[model samples]
Target: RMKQIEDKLEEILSKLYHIENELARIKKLLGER
Candidate 1:
């Protein structure tokens, strides 16, 4: 049960990290222009 919760939390964090990375890429492209 505890392991399941931990896995879910990790999955959420990974998604958040992916979103942040996408935003960073967009910001860099805008800055270049």
Candidate 2:
């Protein structure tokens, strides 16, 4: 069982940047189809 019910994380600066970058790549690849 998990101790915490739910944890939400928000990306900021570096984290957000990497997230956005990855998202962009994913979107682009998906769009290819």
Candidate 3:
């Protein structure tokens, strides 16, 4: 049960990181305009 919870947390963190990266990229593109 403990290992399962840890894996779920890691998955959430990775998804959040991915979303942040996408937002940064979009902002950069918009700034160029």
Candidates in order: C-alpha RMSD to true structure: 0.7, 7.4, 0.5
lDDT of the candidates, in the order given: 0.99, 0.70, 0.99
What value does the lDDT take at residue 5 in candidate 3? 100
RMSD of 3: 0.5
All candidates: TM-score? 0.84, 0.59, 0.91
Query: 1 or 2: which has the higher lDDT?
Result: 1
lDDT of 3 by residue, 1-33 (tens): 999999999999999999999999999999998
Give Cα distance to truth, residue 4, candidate 2, Å. Answer: 26
Worst 10 residues of 3 by lDDT: 24-33
Tens-place lDDT digits, model 2, residues 1-33: 243333223324568889899999999999997
The collision pairs in model 1 are: none
Question: What local lDDT does model 3 show for residue 9?
Answer: 97
Report the number of the highest-TM-score candidate: 3
lDDT score for candidate 1 against the true structure: 0.99
Q: Provide the lDDT at 19 for model 2.
A: 88
Candidate 1 vs candidate 3: which has greater TM-score? 3
